[model samples]
Target: AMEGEHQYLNLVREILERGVKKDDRTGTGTLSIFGPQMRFSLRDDTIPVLTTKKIFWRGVVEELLWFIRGNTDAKELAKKKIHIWNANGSREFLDSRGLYDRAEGDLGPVYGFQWRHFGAEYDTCSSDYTGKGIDQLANILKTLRENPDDRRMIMTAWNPMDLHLMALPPCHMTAQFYVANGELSCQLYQRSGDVGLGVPFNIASYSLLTHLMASMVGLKPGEFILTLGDAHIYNTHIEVLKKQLCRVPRPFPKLRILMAPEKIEDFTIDMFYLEGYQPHSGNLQMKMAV
Candidate 1:
C-alpha cells in the first residue's frame, strides 16, 4: 500500500478536509496543513509516481541529476528540455533582484549549488567555485560505504546565506539517509509543498535519489519517507485535485538504471528509464502560483 499513489491521495484528502484557510506569500490563498508525513516504500521495487495524472519522468530524473552534479545554471537544464525553472530563471526576474548580475537562464545558488558547495561565498552567476566548501554528495557516498550505520549521513540544501541569491528557495530542503540490514532508506523534509504539483514532483525526485544513492553504496533501495511543512492546495487547483482524487491509482512503476556510474556526478539522464508505468489518462494542467 505504501508503494503506490494511495498515500499521496490520502494526504491530499486529509488536507482538504482539515486544512485551515490562510493567506500566503504568493498572494494566492490556500487551504494549508502543518506537519504532515507520508511514507513510500522502495523495498518492493515499486517507484512512487502519480497514477491519476501524467508526470514528466524525464524532467524529474534530469533535475535530480542536475542537483547531484551541483549545477546552478538553468541553461544546462533547458538544454535537456526541462523548463520547470525557466520562469524563475528569466532575465527580468534576475534584474529585479538587483543583487545578481546574471544572464537569462542563470538561477543563482539554488538547490544544486547549495547541495554541492554549501557555505561557499556566492559571487556572480558565472563564477567558478571549484574546490570550495564541503561536498555533501561526495561525503554521503563515502560515509554510506565506509560506515553504513552512521546516523549523520545527511545532505542539506538549505543555505540561509545563499537563499536570497536563488531564483527560488528549495522546497525539498534536506534529506537524511539510513542503512540497516544492507538496505538503504531516506527521509526528506520539505518546508513548503504545492500539493497538486510540487508534492508529486518531490516524491518522484527523492525516491529516484534514494535509488541512486542505494545503488552507489551497493545496497538495495528501501523506504522513502516525506515529511512536509505548510502542505497546501491552491484555491485555483481545487477542481483538478478533486478530479484526480476520483481516479483509481494504477500499479507503481519500476526504475532501471542502464549505466551505473562510479561517482554520483557521472550519471546521465539517458542512463535511467521507467518500466511498467501505466498512469491514468490526463495531464491536469494547473498554473503555478509563483
Candidate 2:
C-alpha cells in the first residue's frame, strides 16, 4: 500500500486536475471523480491520521466514542465543542427535510443511531432505546471472536427505510470487517466524499476504529481501505487545496493506547497519546459544504 498521508494527498491532486465538473446537493459545484479507492497499511504503534494539516484529532476520537455510545443528539457533541453536525442538525435543516416534529439538534436516526439501533423506531434523539434494535458493533465483536474467517461482518448505515428520518443521509454509509493472519482490517464505502474537508477525518476515524476493534479481539491492526462513490472537491475548497498541494505530506503520527479496554465504550481520550506530529504550519480553517 502507498504511504498513508501521500495516498490522501495524491487523491486530492487527481481530483483537482481531472475530476468532472458537476453541481452538488448543497449548490456547491464540485470537481468529482467516481469510484476512487484509497487504502492505508496500519500498525499498532502508529495511526494513519493525516499530517499535511492538523486534523481535529480530539474530535476524531470523541465523535467515534459518541457513535459507539449510540448517540444521535448533536448537542452532545456541541457540549464537547465539536460542532461538525451543527449545520445539518439545525431546526431549519430538519424542517427542510420534512422533520418539523423534531426539535433542535436532533439528528434523527443518523450514523450512530443506525449503527447501534438499526431497525428500532426513532421518536426523539433524547429518548433511550437501549436494547431495541440489532447491536451491530457488539455483533461484529462477536463474529471476530467466535468466527474470525466469516465474510458476513458488515455494518451498514444506509437504511433505506430510515432515510427520510435522517438529518442528513449517511455519507460514510457502510463498512465491512475482515480478519486474516491475526490482523483486523476494514473497508468503508462512502457514497459521497468531500476530498478536502471530510476525507482526512474519515481516513483517521476509520483507521482508529480498526485499531480499537483489533485491540478488542487481540488481533494486530491492519489496513483500512476507503472506497468512494463520488470523490469530490468542493468549489469553495479549490484554492485551499492548491495551497495544500504545495505543502508536503509528512508521515503519520503514532497513537499509543495506555490500556487495553474491557469494552468498546471504555476507550477515552486520556488513555491515548499521539507522538511525533509536526503538521504544516497553519491549521487551515476550511469551511464545510453544508
Candidate 3:
C-alpha cells in the first residue's frame, strides 16, 4: 500500500489524468467478486462512487462501452481517447493470442471470451462464441420492458468450468435490472474488486452499462448500485487512496454515448456515450500483478 507497490492507486491515477482505457475485450474492464449468498438491503441511496476522493467519472463510462463492444484486442481501445490499454498492451508477452494481428497461439480468455463463451470449458477443441451472457443481457432487457417487477432480471458471468481456463474470470459477475415506471435501477455483484484501481473503473463501467441497457429498453437510468465481494486495496495501491483522501472531489463530468445501438448484434463501442470529461489530479504510480 506504500508508494511504489500501489497498483490500484496508479490505475485510478491513470484514468483520472488520462481518461478511460477503451479496449474491445470488455466494454470496460473491472474486477468485482460476489459470494453465492450475500445481500445488502437497499434502504439509503448508497451510491458506489468512492467519496474518499474524486474518481474519474468519464473514463469509467467509456471503459464500460469498450467492454460492451465484445472485443479482446487493445486496437480499438488505443483509439478511444483513453490510454488505459497502453499498460495492458505493453505488458510482456501479454497479447500472445495475436488478437490484434491474427497471430496463432493461445491467449487466455479475456472479457470477450467471458461474455461470449463463459459456458465453454477450456479445451483445444474448436468452438464458437456462444454469446450466452450477451444474449442473457438482451433477453433480460426484453423481460424488463414487459415485466418491470419480475425480481429475476439478472445476468451472470460465473462459470466455474471456464474460470480455470480464463486469464481472469468476470469480476462483474452478475447484474440485476429493476424497472419502475420510466426509471430503471441496476445492481452489480462483483466477485473481486481492487478498491484503489478497480473500484473507480468498476463504477463508471457498470453505470454506462445501466445507461445503455435502460435506453434500449425504453427506461431512464435511475440509480447504479454496487455490491462487492472481497473489496480490498492492493498493498501497492494504498498510497493512491491516501492521495485521493487528501483532496476534495470536483464536479463530475458529463458522459455521451456515441452511436446508439438498437439491436443486440449491433451493440458496440462505436455506440458509446462520451463528450466532456474532467477530473482533479494527484500523484501516484504502481506495477500491476498481471
Candidate 4:
C-alpha cells in the first residue's frame, strides 16, 4: 500500500483514548504517551508534510535552513518575518527564565549552536562561530559521501551543559543518520513532543533535513523515523486534535530539489518545490505550551 500517513492519525487516536494524564513544565498538562514511533517514507520523493492539516510549509523550510546555517538568534529568523520563536525569545520570557542578562530575541545555545558547535563556548548569539566546535552536519555528510556504512553519523541538539542558557531545552533532541544500498535514512529520538502543534512541525522539519542530507551526499532519500519519549497532546489542544483526527489523511506531497548548493547553508527556500500538496482545509490553530 502507498504511504497514507495513518501513523500520525492512529497515534493521535491512541493518545486520546488511553494516554495517561500528567502535569508538565508549561502547566498546560497533557494526555501523555511514552516511547512511540512513527516512520514516514521518503521514497519516491514524498514529503510527510501531513495531509490532515496545512502546516506552515515556508516556516518549516526556513527554520531548518536557519539551523543548517547555525543561526541561534531568533531575531535573524524574525527578520524574515517568522515569529515562531518570538514568544520564547521575548524579553519578558527571558526575564522570567532568569535570563535577565540576556538580550531579547536571543535563543541561547539552541539546536543550531549545538548542531554546528557542540563543544564550543557560547557567549551570546551574535558572535561568529565559524570553526569553533565540532560541525556535526558537515561531518555526517563527509561520512556519507566517503563511507556510508559508518555507525557514528549522528547529530545531537541536547547539550546538557548549555540547557540553562537556552530559552527552552531541546525536545527533538538527537538524530542518527544511517545509509544502506545507496540510500540515507534518519531516526530522531525526541524526549518531548507537543503532539498537536510541534510534533507535526518536527516531522516535516526532520524529513526535509533528511532529504537535504541525502541530496548533499549524493544518495537517495530513505525513511525518516521519529522516536518519541514523552509524546503528549496538551489539554488545550485536545479538542482541536479530536477534530483533526476525524479528517482522513491524504497522500503525501512530493518534493523536487531544483537546485543543489555547494554548501548546505546556501540552500534557499525557493530552491525546493513541493509538488501536489493540498492539505485538508479548515486550518486548525492550537496554543503552544511555552
Candidate 5:
C-alpha cells in the first residue's frame, strides 16, 4: 500500500499507466479514471503536502482560511496575495455567462458560502442577503468538544439550490470528521480532481483544515483520507507528470500552529508555519482547466 508522500506519487503512476483518454469540459482532454482513494497518516507530525515539487503552502492555508471565514470575494483573497481564483473571478468570464451584474472580482456564493451559510438567500455576488443557516465549521468544533465520538461530525459545501448562484460549484464537496482513541481524522470527497495541478493544493488545504480542527479541540491529528471521483490529468500535464514520477519524495513536513484562538475564524495568517519542509527544487506549471 502506498503511504505518506509516496501515496500521491503512486496514484499518479497508476493513473498514467491505466487511465483512459477522454474528452473533458475544458476541451483539453484527459487521462481519466474513476474512483481512486489515497490515505496519509497525520500521525507522527506528518503533514502530507507533496514533496516531489514545491507546493504553494501559503496559498493553500490562505484559501482554506477564506473558506472557513465564509468569504466569497476573490478580491479579499487577492488582498492576501492569493491569485488562484483570479481566473474564475474575471469580469469577462462572468459577463459571458450573463453575470454582468457581478463586481469585477466577486466569486459568487462558492465554497465559503455553503460551508458557513448554507441555504442562505442571495441576490448579487457582493450584496448581503438576510437569512439564517448552519455554520457547519462552528458546529463541528462544538460537536468535537462536547461529543468527541459522534459519527455525525461532518461539514459539507454542496448546497443544491445555491449552485447556480456560485461562480463555480464545489469540487471537494464534503468533509467528514472522525475521532477515535483520542485522535481526530478527516475524510474528504472531491467530485472532480485535476490530479496534476489541483490535487496537491486540495490535499494541503484539507490536511490543514483537519489540523486546525484537531487543535481547536484537544486531540492530535490522526489521518487524512481522500476519495476522488473523476480524478484526471489534463493532456497538457502528461510530460510534467512523467517528470514528477521520476523524483524521490522527501520527508513530509510538520505544521506548527503558534497561536490558539477561541474560534476557527479567530485564527489569523501569523498563526501557522511549516517546519522542516525540505522539498525538491523547481515546480511544474500546468494550465488550469477553468
Candidate 6:
C-alpha cells in the first residue's frame, strides 16, 4: 500500500486541526499507535523496513538481527549503522563500578546481551556466560507446528538482574505464541511503549520476527496479540503521534538475514536484510529514557 507523499508533514497538525482532544490512560497525552491492521504484506523472505524520518533504516535492521543473532557490542553496532547506543554499548561493570548513576549504568542482558548470556551472574559466572539466553522464537515456531494446542510457547527477556545493570530494563520484553488449526498467533507483553518513537519500531520488529520464525517452521503468520503492561503516550509526544495518523502508509519492505555461523554469538551486522525499503518520512520525536 504505497500511498503517495502525505499531504501534511507534522503529526501535530492532524491533531490540532482534526483530532478529538481527550485525556486518556497516558495522563494528559495523545494516544494513537496501534491500528487494527498496518496493511503490511511482504513479498520476499527477508529484511524489514523502518518508515521514519529520524532513525537510520540500516541501523534498525542491524539492531534487530543483532538481537536475532545475540550480540551486544558497540563496535559491531557501530559498523552496521550509526551508533544508537546511549552510552558505551556493554559496560557490565557500570552496575558495580560506581561510575554513572545506577539507573543509567550497566543494563543487564537486553535483547542481544540476554540472548547470548541467558542468566549470567557477575558474582558467580564471571566471563562465563550461561548461553541459555537465546532466540526462543524458533522454539515457539516448532512447537506451534508440532503441537498446535500448546499455549505455553512464550519467549521472555525481563530479567530481575537486568534492573540492576541496565540504564533501563527492557520494556517490550515478553511474548507468547499460540497456534490453532492452521493459524499461528502471538501475544506480546510490552511493559512500556512510547507512542511517538519506539512503538512503531517495536511493532514492526516483533511482527517481522514472528514472520521469520513462522516461515522457518513452515507456518503462515497469524494474528498478533499485543498485550501492554503499561501502554502510554508521553505528554510531550502527543502531537507527533497524532500527526502520524494522518500520514499515508508506505509499501512493505523486504527482510533479509545474511547467512552466518551456526552459533548466535558469532554472527555480526554483515548478515542482515534491507535492499529496497521505502517508508513514510516525518520528523517524529520522542522522550528518551535516562
Measured by TM-score, the strongest candidate is 4
Output the better candidate (1/2) by lDDT: 2
**What C-alpha RMSD separates each model from the true structure?**
1.5, 1.3, 9.2, 1.2, 1.6, 6.1
Candidates 5 and 6 compared: the better one by lDDT is: 5
- lDDT computed for candidate 2: 0.87
Q: Write the per-residue lDDT of candidate 2 for residues 68-106, one digit (tens) a residue.
A: 888888899999999988888897899999999898999
For model 3, residues 55-125, the per-residue Cα lDDT tens digits are: 55556655555455444445555566665654445434344323343222233455545554545453431
Which of the two candidates, 2 or 4, achieves a greater TM-score against the reference? 4
Residue pairs in clash, model 2: none
Candidate 3 is scored at a TM of: 0.65
* lDDT over C-alpha atoms for residue 76 of model 2: 94
What TM-score, over all chains together, does every model reach? 0.95, 0.97, 0.65, 0.98, 0.96, 0.66
Tens-digit per-residue lDDT, 1-290, candidate 5: 36787888888888899999998878899998899999888887678988888899989988988888788888887988889998888998778666788887777878877788777776555665323577887888999999988988878888888777677778999999999998899999999999999999999989988888898899999999999999998999999889988888888899988877998977887988898998888777888886
Per-residue lDDT of 165-257 in model 6, one digit per residue for the tens?
554567678777766555455667777655456655666677666655565555666655445554445567665656666556554465565
- Once model 6 is optimally superposed onto the true structure by TM-score, how far is the C-alpha of residue 155 displaced, in angstroms? 0.8
Best by lDDT: 4
Cα lDDT computed for each candidate against the true fold = 0.86, 0.87, 0.54, 0.90, 0.85, 0.53
Residue 201, candidate 6: alpha-carbon lDDT: 68
- Clashes in model 4: which pairs? none
lDDT of 1 by residue, 47-99 (tens): 89887888888889888888887787788878878898888888777777664
Question: Is 3 or 5 the stronger prediction by TM-score?
Answer: 5
Residue 220's lDDT within candidate 2 is: 88
